[PDB]
Amino acid sequence: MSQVILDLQLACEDNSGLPEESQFQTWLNAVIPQFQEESEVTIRVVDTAESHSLNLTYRGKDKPTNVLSFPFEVPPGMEMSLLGDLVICRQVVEKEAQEQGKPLEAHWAHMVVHGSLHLLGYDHIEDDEAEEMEALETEIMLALGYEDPYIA
Ligand code: NI
């Protein structure tokens, strides 16, 4: 099997100019299935304020970020398909894509791809650990038809 049930939550004042739910679905299929097959993730797009708040109260960082990853812990001895949530700030994503001169769409995809990896247990604090994650990101991204966000 291969199935990623997506719960897309648009929680911005506007909600216009965001990726189509099918796009998120597409990006999600290129990252998760190959690790869980049967799974489901929630992804809510928010505004700087909420992001700022979530980031400060859960990561202890006074500022908004592009992607907050909240991986679901599975209680010892339990079958669970729920992977966690991705909180993506549209303001940050749009600003970054502009500063890095990347296609807004390609950056969004990167956000859910990177985020999804964090949901699956990947991290990038340790050089070796990061090397493995970026390798995967690059791979997934090329397979989606976007340029490799790395190699700069
Ligand atoms: Ni990260």
> To what resolution in angstroms was this structure determined?
2.7
Could you tell me if 146 and 106 are in contact, meaning their C-beta atoms sit under 8 angstroms apart?
yes
Residue ranges for the binding site for Zn(2+)?
A: 114, 118, 124
DSSP letters spanning 47-67: -HHHHHHHHHHHH--SS--SE
Cα–Cα distances (Å) from 66 to 39, 60, 93, 96, 112, in that order, read: 23, 15, 5, 8, 10
* Cross-strand pairs, 70: 85
Nearest to 83 by CA among 119, 131, 37: 119
Experimental method: X-ray
Distance CA 89, CA 87 (A): 7
Q: What is the CATH number of domain 1-152?
A: 3.40.390.30
Q: What is the spatial distance between Cα 29 and Cα 22, in angstroms, rounded to a whole number?
A: 10
How many angstroms separate the CA atoms of 104 and 46, rounded? 16
- Kindly state the DSSP code that residue 73 receives in the 8-state scheme: P
Tell how far the Cα of 94 is from the centroid of ligand 1, in angstroms: 17
* H or E element in which residue 44 lies: strand 38-46
**What are the boundaries of each domain within the chain?**
1-152
Ligand 1 center–CA 149 separation, angstroms: 13
